[PDB]
Amino acid sequence: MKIVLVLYDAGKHAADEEKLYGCTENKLGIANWLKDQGHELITTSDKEGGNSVLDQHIPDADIIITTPFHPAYITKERIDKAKKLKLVVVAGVGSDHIDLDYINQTGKKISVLEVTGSNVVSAAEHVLMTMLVLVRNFVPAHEQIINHDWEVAAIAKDAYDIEGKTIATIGAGRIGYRVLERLVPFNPKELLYYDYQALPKDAEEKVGARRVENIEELVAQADIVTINAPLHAGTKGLINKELLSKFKKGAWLVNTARGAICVAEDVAAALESGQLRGYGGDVWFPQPAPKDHPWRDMRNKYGAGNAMTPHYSGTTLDAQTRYAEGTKNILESFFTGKFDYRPQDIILLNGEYITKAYGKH
């Protein structure tokens, strides 16, 4: 089989860390196995533009392996040229960089598999971290130190404890629930969730969560909102000017899910106006994020409220070994012709939606 593998380049950083499997230099650590299995592997980070290495090899690729942190956008146009494509794998979690609805609506026999659960803890930790960083005003505090300054009041004037705050998640799946679990001992005033899929009642009671039926009522009462749903037609552009106007004034918003769930300029405008006190996360649309993407320079009125990072929470070294192993397992399920995929890894099976988490079908 011909396999095209699109990952980020590590460049000079590859020499620093042998456990960085998720880059083009190291090929998920599965290259020896793929070679022994008799497959052809094209590895590249070159994923944009008509004569990219990606586009050169799409026409006869049997399998494309992608990774969300450097996502090959498998558009309708690319799908139409992909005459041999049978399987797209996501080394990570989240398959929205592939035009899933086009595959599904046309009935093309392409399966889309991701390594469910591989980095959900990693993302949940990043959520907790970003909530604390924003609420406690950490970014300007650190900036003050490295700029050789000292003025406690300049930080304290917009620093709070997370204790006593009302916290809402949009999406209460693997990440959203793990976020709620980690928040319990911080003594929030209340933990809330909005999801068309209810939590199991035992899980709900374990974290003291209350389900809120509609998203406007959810955000209106939340000091802190976190986005933990996949990107699909029902969440694309969900966080927009109108919905932001219904947030509690001065709320903190965290998004480690997908950038395009938010309207980028509407989040920036809400931060600059004080509708939000802070915004942070690791995910952007598109990725790599352009140098002038508005989320880089946006700040609140105090010059703070920005806890953005590149997309890496799901590619910590601990997560990388897990999604590398899961990618191998998915590939083996395909190669053997058993197609004995783990049920939870299946986004599309030969064009059909198996997941329930990407909207109702």
Place this chain on the structure above:
Amino acid sequence: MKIVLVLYDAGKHAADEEKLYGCTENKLGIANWLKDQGHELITTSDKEGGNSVLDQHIPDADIIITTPFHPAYITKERIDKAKKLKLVVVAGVGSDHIDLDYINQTGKKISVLEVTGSNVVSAAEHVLMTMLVLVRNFVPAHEQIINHDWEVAAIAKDAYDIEGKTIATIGAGRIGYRVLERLVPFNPKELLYYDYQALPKDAEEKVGARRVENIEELVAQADIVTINAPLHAGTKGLINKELLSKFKKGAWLVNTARGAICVAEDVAAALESGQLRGYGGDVWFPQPAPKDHPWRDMRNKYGAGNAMTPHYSGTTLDAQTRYAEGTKNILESFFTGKFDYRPQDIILLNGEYITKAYGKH
């Protein structure tokens, strides 16, 4: 009575935030209350140098109110000139900026009171935040974004999950235990503590903590060490070159307790050499931290591993009102002649140690 109140100045920031009780402008909310009682209140941030406002008023001050974030150093030289001093109050937690041993060992009839518990949650949150920021390599990740760069591998090469790490606290009192409670749902490999005061078995079991009686055995097995003990003769310089040499190579160290529990240059050398991967916290010796303090510029080999802030974790807006009210209550106990202090607030009672947490007596 004459009361000298030493707080940080908020300056222009006072106009931004009415809840900033802990600055010289707002005087803990007690200025008019003291005035209506006939007391004279001198308020200042000028606390260094022989003709500081503090030193001008020390000779006839009946009461000195301090705060850890901008600490008046009530040294033995100042005590010797403080001929009317009867009470030192700490608007906050931690009394080490007063020479407690000098008071006790030379029979000075001075009580020292602090607002125990008023910001222990705030500090515990800051510990959790700093652990996450360091382990997950957040600081350089955010720096990359605001420098208009994008390179996932430059961050991921030294990014981990906190899950699966072994975490040790030196000091398992109000903050240390609250840190352990917050870490439980993060699924650490193990939680450990070292403290001459044992936790009750039920308290140990609640957090799955294991007591280690030897400090070298404790640090040798810890991926993450957190300092949560007061500064006293038994902890001053505890974290020195020899102990750091027994830390697990590449450990992360968090200190929201007091700067001088660490030998400053020993910490910096361990970070620059890789014995530590990261250091962070909000506390310094002395405070305000000099512009040249080595904890400002120290970095690991990758230019990161520094999560320092100014001393503010215990002066969030949620904390300030708690320790302001508690300061008023301590003052009232003194003014009425009842001396009905909360027992947990008493560090020294007319020179005698009441606390057990500042070493054995």
